[PDB]
Design a protein around this nucleic acid. Sequence first.
RNA 1: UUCACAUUGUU
RNA 2: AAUGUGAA
Length: 803
Amino acid sequence: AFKPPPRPDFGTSGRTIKLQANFFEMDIPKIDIYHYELDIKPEKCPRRVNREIVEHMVQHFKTQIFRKPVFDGRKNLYTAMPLPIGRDKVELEVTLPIFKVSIKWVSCVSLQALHDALSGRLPSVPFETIQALDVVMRHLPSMRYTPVGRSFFTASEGCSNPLGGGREVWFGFHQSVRPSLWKMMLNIDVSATAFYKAQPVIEFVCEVLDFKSIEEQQKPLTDSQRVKFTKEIKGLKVEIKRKYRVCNVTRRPASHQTFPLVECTVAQYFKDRHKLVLRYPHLPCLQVGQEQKHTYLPLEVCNIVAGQRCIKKLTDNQTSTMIRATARSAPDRQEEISKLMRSADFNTDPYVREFGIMVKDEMTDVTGRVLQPPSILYGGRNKAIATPVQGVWDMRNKQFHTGIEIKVWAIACFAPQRQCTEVHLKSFTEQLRKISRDAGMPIQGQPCFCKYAQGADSVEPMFRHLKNTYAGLQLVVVILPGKTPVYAEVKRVGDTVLGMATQCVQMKNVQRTTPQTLSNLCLKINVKLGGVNNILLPQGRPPVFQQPVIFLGADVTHPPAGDGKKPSIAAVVGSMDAHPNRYCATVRVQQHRQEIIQDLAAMVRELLIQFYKSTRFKPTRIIFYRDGVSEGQFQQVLHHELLAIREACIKLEKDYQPGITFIVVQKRHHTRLFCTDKNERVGKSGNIPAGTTVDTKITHPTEFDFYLCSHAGIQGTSRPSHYHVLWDDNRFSSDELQILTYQLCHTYVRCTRSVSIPAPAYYAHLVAFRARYHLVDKEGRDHQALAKAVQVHQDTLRTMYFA
RNA sequence: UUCACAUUGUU
RNA sequence: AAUGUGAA
Ligand SMILES: [Mg+2]
Ligand SMILES: [Mg+2]
């Protein structure tokens, strides 16, 4: 239950395609790097400050110690050659315009062993070596650019990309060192993010408060303005030589604001001590440093410090500007990455030079294979077969495999009548019934109930009435004016309080209908009512379907940044037929920002029981798609969760041991794939075609992983999903697993398109999202409360309410 | 809330 | 959540 299976073989299905990857081959010497531990006192210093300290230590003690070491920013120092220190732990006094730095030799890192690991010779890739290489490649840019995670950012020279509110777009790149079947690879991608302008605080005030000039406000500021500004600058760093974090903004103007020196004002203090007359004394001051102290600084003497990323949310306009700034088609992105790498000068990096490393300035050529899409089987009387072309198909002249006959339904319109009239509702009903009839989901008549309502308060009593009054009620269609807290309430009542099927529609989609919109809407409706939209062509499925098999999807969605308290949400879905089409859901609230699904065993047990209830089979196989786990958590996650699945099986039945395949689905990596041949590009975005598969050259040297871009690239540059097999009792071959995954990408019911991840994982996402909606504004006893919030009604348990 | 894709995620 | 590109 510990180590990931070796790659069984290489895929052979599908026609070849020439690709380029944003992986750049690295030359690594055979020598041994030497690793030393570093302890810096005081120990609370920022990583930047630590790097500065070590740099200064090397420059001040260059004599008879040390030539060019690299530092990870905390406790790790690597050197290409040994240091005249042996294993001795020495204490160095470093004074920087006060720091005690102890150096103890830890170990040796053999790059030769890494060469053994990249070949077949060594079973595993030694992580210490990878980390060493990463510290090497990260040393220089960490002190030249602004490090953000594994990326680096900078103010692009010659360009200004203002966002408003004292913010601008900084451009940069993700850089990571990764082992491959081929060589060591430098993964390089371009990115952009919001940073605070390094402008005077006065101009920051002007941009925040919308002043063209500071003279627009000659008064001391309204409380609204002072608060609006306080919320913007609080937490940011300003300077005068001296760095300060802004903890507050004084209420009183600099002329009036006082402090004890006996009391003295700020304006006066800057007159007497600094010979400074304040040109804007009517404006307030910034309280900096410790908030228990009384250090107040005028706005005029302060600048926003450069290199501070905007953590706060961007406004709608700032976001629009951001997207316009960073919108790149696939070829445009390929060229920007290439331009970046050619101008990067990695091989002239003195620290890269010290460790004898060479980096190839060209993208790696890779051969992909474009898998054939599955045929999609429909129902009705004509039993049409749809053939996905470039990851897309449609439902024109097609009927659902199993269409629900709708006899009893209602309409609840929370939109104002003056905006969404009865005529609109009637026309909408006619159109929807036409489309529904075409799709094989006949809405046989008019709704038995159609009334207007207002506010969330009216939801529960209206729904309670509906459930009491109309026997055999199948659906309530809820018309919403737009973004409103009524949606969350309709879902709370419907899914968790009364167990009623709802379908919400925006007012604008009722006022102006299109065949396509109504079609997709009919997809959702048919699914919610227990229907089967379509199935994979039975004879076109891989042989895994010859025995009972269940498909599980799992995801943990986490609370937004700058948060605590809000729980993480874990969602697991399971297939309930042989198609596979129908799914059931399980969802739990859990510890804040925990990736490991805590209650997995119980969830899986539920899903297995329900599977048996639906199919009268016990799965001989369990295929588990696990979204969002990064490499650094493979071991922990697999250890807990695999054992959880096994436990769920054992407790269900003595000696019930279905084979488990554990795949990690990853969409948030930095691997990009591009068409080498321009004539292979698809659409306006110029992306690789749906079905593109890569399991060579840039993948793992020993393990079972692959890239599958299962979706059509509509806009920007596609993200090919990465699949990493952490465990496989079923002994899948690459071909069968890749084809299975791809086919699963075609079973997603909310659209007639192949999606970017297999339907189970996507459904898991939808479930966690709905749970987020159930928990809106609700976040021992509190865990019980939150658990209750996400617990769906009994009549909702066997449904696809999350569609 | 029709949907997918993509982006931001010592004063 | 925001913002874009699109679809029978
Ligand atoms: Mg997740
Ligand atoms: Mg959106």
